[PDB]
Amino acid sequence: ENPMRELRIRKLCLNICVGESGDRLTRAAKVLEQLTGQTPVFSKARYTVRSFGIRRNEKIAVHCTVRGAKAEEILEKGLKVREYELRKNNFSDTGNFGFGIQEHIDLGIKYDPSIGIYGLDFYVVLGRPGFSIADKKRRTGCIGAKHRISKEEAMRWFQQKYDGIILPG
Template identity: 90%
Template sequence: MIAVHCTVRGAKAEEILEKGLKVREYELRKNNFSDTGNFGFGIQEHIDLGIKYDPSIGIYGLDFYVVLGRPGFSIADKKQKTGRIGFRHRIRKEEAMRWFQQKVCGFFYTGWAVIPADYLLCVAN
């Protein structure tokens, strides 16, 4: 088993996230979101993303993990003069869920999925 961790930012990250969410039909559970505003999900088969099947590799799954940030978050990662991110500047779970709904037109489910009426309008745009 081989594991790979890759960081992608910008437009390419949005493109990859869009493909992954399309496989999941733009639905996530509320439990997929952490208290610090990050969220993640997984897909079972990489061929669902449109990648060609290679018999020598087989089928493998992918995990997506999204870390949201704001300008100024890098002060906590500096080596010298490390700063703290204030409570009001942190991203909370509710804000990340709101971003997911507005930016990606996603929705949440618990058990049986219920599609909201405005979902079809978001997908059409």
């Protein structure tokens, strides 16, 4: 059949967005250290609304990206607590789906009384071999039409691989 149309997870991005900066944000950074085995990166204050206590140039959220077998393992750990029920509204038109979970105690982490209670967003992006064209510098080119992931293809791949159930939104 298709020679090299096998779908594959390009990366898995975890993101923890807290309200205020300080000790809680530092702890939300420490939790990702043991969750992903790598140092996260801080994102801060794209704007200034002041309606809930943020300003310009203030550390707000932490995030990171995992690729490869570790990304697949983290996605499996997330779908474990998710129990493999995804809604129809979780999938985007491009083929990327995210679910989000509750506080990270259900992932299999030893609870620490000093860290606190934080969750993550757990956004997943799907890909195919050949999507690295739009990322290189020597020559840039669009993906195309028959190669880009569709809407139904993502949920079909999810049902085929992880045997999850798709609920109507």
